[PDB]
């Protein structure tokens, strides 16, 4: 603990994204929004707009 900031430990995590000519298996939460009924809304279910 008695070191300078340059010598103190730092935990590093590197996120790399492997994008091949293969199906994506990781996607974003896609901004899960609440359901609204009995009101004219612009809906999108699983990409179906």
């Amino acid at each position: 603990p008695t070191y300078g900031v340059g010598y103190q430990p730092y935990r590093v995590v590197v996120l790399s994204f492997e994008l091949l000519h293969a199906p994506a298996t990781v996607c974003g939460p896609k901004k899960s929004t609440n359901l609204v009924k009995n009101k004219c809304v612009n809906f999108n279910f699983n990409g179906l707009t």
């Epitope: 603990p1 008695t2 070191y3 300078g4 010598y7």
Partner: antibody, heavy 122, light 108 residues
């Protein structure tokens, strides 16, 4: 800065030797310095006993670790040393010093205290 | 084990000359070293840290050859009050904070 030692000057064999070092030139709660104890028998070389950090923990000698403990008190701004089962080989002058360990192996005692002579005899 | 060996045990030189104390570590790791001076009846005084850095208040005549396993403290111009016992101190992994056997510098 200054360091002053305090404690009984006589310890009977096979008993705990207690010492307390009080500093007044700075702060022991600083996160840049250790506070250590270094002893030397009369006419002999220096022997680092142990160094304590402000939080609680400390590290000691690989020979005296069984019968040694260190404590700290930020409120009173002083750190203490206990040496259990003192034999006749502990008859020595004990200084308390200020340690700076910046990189890995850089560990020097910046300012020493005058030290007190504890002679262990019956 | 990283054992510390200083040399020589006693050094006989007169004021005006230059003294060369050697502090070699075992055949082992290499990094920094600290040199301390201790006069009779006084607590040891820090002379040099990080294998050559004059402490706060050390004259320019003190220097350190901070190099491999072997280290060297050099005193350019021996002054009358520069004759004392000199200890080199390392901080290895195990044992931590090893001290040298000490070099006694006296007036020939």
């Amino acid at each position: 800065v200054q360091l002053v030692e305090s404690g009984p000057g006589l310890v009977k064999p096979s008993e705990t030797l207690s010492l307390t070092c009080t500093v007044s030139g700075g702060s022991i709660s600083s996160s840049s310095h250790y506070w250590g104890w270094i002893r030397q028998p009369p006419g002999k070389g220096l022997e680092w006993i142990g160094s304590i950090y402000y939080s609680e923990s400390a590290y000691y000698n690989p020979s005296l670790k069984s019968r040694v403990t260190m404590s700290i008190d930020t409120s009173k701004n002083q750190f203490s040393l206990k040496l259990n089962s003192v034999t006749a080989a502990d008859t020595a002058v004990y200084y308390c010093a200020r340690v700076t360990e910046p990189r890995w192996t850089s560990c020097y005692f910046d300012y020493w205290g005058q030290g007190t002579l504890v002679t262990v005899s019956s | 084990e990283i054992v510390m060996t200083q040399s020589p045990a006693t050094l006989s030189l007169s004021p005006g000359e230059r003294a060369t104390l050697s502090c070699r570590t075992s055949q082992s790791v290499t990094s920094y070293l600290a040199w301390y001076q201790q006069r009779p009846g006084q607590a040891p005084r820090l002379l040099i840290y990080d294998a050559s850095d004059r402490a706060t208040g050390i004259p320019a005549r003190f220097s350190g050859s901070g190099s491999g396993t072997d280290f060297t403290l050099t005193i350019s111009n021996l002054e009358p009050e520069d004759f004392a016992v000199y200890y080199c101190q390392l901080r290895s992994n195990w044992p931590p904070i090893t001290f040298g056997q000490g070099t006694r510098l006296e007036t020939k």
